[PDB]
Chain A
Amino acid sequence: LNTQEIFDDWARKVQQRNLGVSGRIFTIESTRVRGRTGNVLKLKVNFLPEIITLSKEVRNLKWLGFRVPLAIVNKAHQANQLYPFAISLIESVRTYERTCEKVEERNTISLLVAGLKKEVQALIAEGIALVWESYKL
């Protein structure tokens, strides 16, 4: 029952590759590739493990409290101050994908939805085109 090994591996991995994972807020939108039938591509925002790292730091600090790497703490702080925006964006993307699944699983509907679908993609294009708009977000 030793945890210093885990604390060291945590500070290790976070300081081995999460040194750059921290402030990935600029490139808000990122296209993809998904090797499947047809090899489709989806849309993705860059905040997958970072949010859990924020929770990790808060847990170590309130829980035990170490001489937690201050650089990682401030980078977590910078992720926090931009995190809710990303949550809303990610859920919007997921709902968008779910709706596109329902829409294209039907065919008649496309005729009537065409306008709204173009509207959604109009704002999607305007959202993707820009990455990191500190003023208008």
Chain B
Amino acid sequence: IANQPVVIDNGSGVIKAGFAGDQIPKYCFPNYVGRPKHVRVMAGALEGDIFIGPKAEEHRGLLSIRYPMEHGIVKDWNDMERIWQYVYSKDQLQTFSEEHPVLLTEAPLNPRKNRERAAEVFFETFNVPALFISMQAVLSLYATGRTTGVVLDSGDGVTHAVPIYEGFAMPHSIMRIDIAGRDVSRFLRLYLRKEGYDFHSSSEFEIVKAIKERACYLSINPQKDETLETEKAQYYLPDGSTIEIGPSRFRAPELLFRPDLIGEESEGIHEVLVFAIQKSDMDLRRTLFSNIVLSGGSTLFKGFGDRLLSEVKKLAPKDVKIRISAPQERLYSTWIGGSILASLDTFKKMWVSKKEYEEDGARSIHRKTF
């Protein structure tokens, strides 16, 4: 028994959290940790070293922003502890980690050590009454209400497709590549350098993310538009300068459909969907093609869904109704799905109790991983 389950949606770029039963996540902020770079000289300065959340975003110039999680895998656990601890601070939740069971979203095909050490972190430093690690696609489909269909997500560090059949997420059809939002921003940074504009500071990579979020689009024809000179719209920096982008705005999110530009034998998003559908039972292909759900912030580019339809039509068999849905809460899909899932009475039997974790250990988590 506890108060209420807290759905903490992780993400390599933006963490999202709130209590279960909530409508929208009330607490969302970037998943980075910024510590100052300069020298504390004057007294009365910004006290404290590590900053997370709105304060780290505000005084962005001083920090040396780093990410503790990359490609859905935690690289530094200390920064993650401070991030989770920040989630439970007075600025976000104002609660205690002893009276709340925790729903935790997590990307597929990740190492066992993520669930194991993350569970140790929660049940030991936080001592939560109940932890429950789950997928992300299952939650997104629960958020849309329907039940069978694939889920195409592309967050900040991962991207995958999961063919879900009535909740049983088919584990033998989850294609997963590691080319997501942050990497698109990284490649955009490279193209900005090729344009002439240099951005290499860690607290400037964020400006590159801002440019990706408000100045890029997806060309329908990938090559016909490359053979033309666009209008070259400008961009206003926080500094007040001006950057004319040019061709570095459509080729930047082109990476998601062709990771040859980054030099990698992986596949595009369209191939992840088509391979995820084709590596399933032939009796469900039409049902999966009639139900595609997008989620994740990288599915917010202009002309994304339209280009995805064109690509899938080029790869799907002829005269099969393809249908891509795209709800208005792609950033909040996994969190809303967590709010629906954890607010049910079956969640009591679906979690892992603290007592159980102390009895068996990590094997209990891998046992009851679904």
- Direct interface between A and B, CB < 8 A: no
Interface residues of B (CB under 8 A from A): none
